[PDB]
Amino acid sequence: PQITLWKRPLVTIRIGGQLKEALLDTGADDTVLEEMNLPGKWKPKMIGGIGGFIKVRQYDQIPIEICGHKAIGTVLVGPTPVNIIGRNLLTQIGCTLNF
């Protein structure tokens, strides 16, 4: 697919039994999802952007389906205002910038 940027590049993602709308975000190194109580081990982390830092929980090797494409990797879970698909998973679904 090709996604123009007139509007936010929101797409439907699936993580287990939850479907969410998430930004395809080339400006994010890592994937950050809204608060959710995922199973398994995790580690605490601080992540920073505009406005400062929030505390997240890092879960590894989490399968996520993005627009019907399979990905699996690290997801950061915390009080983000928007779900964010970062470069760690964008590469896995074959995503590039073109102009």
Positions touching ligand MZ2 (CB under 6 A) are: 25, 27-30, 32, 47-50, 80-82, 84, 86
Please tell me whether residue 99 binds a copy of itself under the rule CB under 8 A.
yes
Q: How far apart are CA 30 and CA 73, in angstroms?
A: 10
Look at residues 2, 7, 1, 12 and name the one whose alpha carbon lies nearest to residue 83: 12
Element (H, E) at 90: helix 87-90
Annotation says 30 is catalytic: no
Active-site choice (25, 29, 30, 60) = 25
Identify the residue among 16, 18, 29, 35 touching a copy of itself (CB under 8 A).
29
